[PDB]
């Protein structure tokens, strides 16, 4: 009954970052190296792009209204009828050539959202350059943790006291102890290991049965875990080896929508993957996902 289908040919370098918005029916995500915001509506099949002056590697709903995203080393706030891209706040400012990557917002309205060195080719860096932030609602910003690798994939337990997190070049998922009034954590410690075959972890989402979902970069595949064991529920491959992230959708979120990348591919790997830098959709998972959180500044 898993279905997993090609819904969106337009070929972008990098997918990442796939959010639902219930409100329009529509998915928004960016391109990373492309420079776009894009808004995906399902119902019309139409997709608008904001064009922005550096790398943009996540976008968020705004609850007051719009968008905000992070572009370069920019916490920044998006109106989408102008199209007019302001900054709410900066970080690393000390760091020759870093950005951004995964962010998400938490169950109290805070963006959080990690950075890394910018790469010469996927996972060729400089170590350790990274840190994870978050924006709080007074656009005031916290820092939790340097020497991080890649910042990616994170999501928060449905009980909101456990925040998951990925630094891709660990290949582990890790959780931390989390405190919902104050943003805060602590005790970090192991949740799965990632295998061989399973290649870098990427992106990353819960479910409404509080198992977590992780594409695969290299994997071409998604995986479901329980973090409670440290055992791996499930596998779903896809067509495309550089899945980058995954999200819920759809009618009560019963749809998974995967992003995936075709930068990094040579020749031959491009005529493998047809479909590589195209948006999947996954159905009969046989279990939602939650709806996303709107940063509350
Ligand atoms: O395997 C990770 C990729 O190399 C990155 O460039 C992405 O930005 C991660 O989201
Ligand atoms: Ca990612």
Not at 50 to 57: G, L, Q
Not at 80 to 95: I, T
Not at 263 to 269: M, V
Request: aromatic share 10%; net charge negative.
């Amino acid at each position: 009954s898993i279905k997993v289908e090609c819904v969106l040919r337009e070929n972008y370098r990098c997918g990442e970052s796939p959010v639902w918005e219930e409100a329009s029916q529509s998915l928004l995500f960016v391109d990373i190296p492309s420079k776009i915001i894009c808004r995906w509506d399902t119902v019309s099949n139409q997709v608008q792009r904001v064009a922005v002056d550096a790398p943009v590697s996540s976008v968020a709903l705004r609850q007051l209204g719009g968008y905000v995203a992070t572009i370069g080393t920019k916490f920044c706030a998006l109106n989408w009828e102008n199209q007019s891209v302001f900054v709410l706040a900066m970080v690393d400012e000390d760091k020759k050539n870093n950005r951004f990557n995964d962010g998400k917002v938490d169950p109290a309205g805070r963006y959080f959202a990690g950075t890394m060195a910018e790469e010469t080719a996927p996972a060729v860096l400089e170590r350790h350059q990274g840190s994870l932030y978050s924006l709080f609602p007074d656009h005031s910003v916290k820092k939790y943790f340097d020497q991080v690798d890649i910042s990616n994939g994170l999501d928060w337990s449905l009980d909101h006291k456990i925040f998951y997190y990925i630094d891709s070049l660990s290949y582990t998922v890790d959780a931390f102890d989390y405190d919902l009034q104050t943003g805060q954590i602590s005790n970090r410690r192991i949740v799965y290991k990632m295998e061989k075959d399973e290649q870098i972890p990427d992106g990353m989402c819960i479910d409404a049965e509080g198992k977590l979902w992780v594409a695969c970069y290299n994997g071409g595949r998604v995986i479901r875990l329980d973090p409670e064991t440290g055992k791996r529920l499930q596998t779903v491959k896809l067509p495309v080896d550089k899945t980058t992230s995954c999200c819920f959708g759809g009618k009560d979120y019963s749809e998974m929508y995967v992003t995936c990348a075709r930068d990094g591919l040579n020749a031959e790997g491009l005529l493998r993957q047809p479909d590589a830098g195209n948006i999947f959709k996954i159905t009969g998972l046989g279990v939602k996902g939650i709806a996303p959180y709107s940063y509350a500044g």
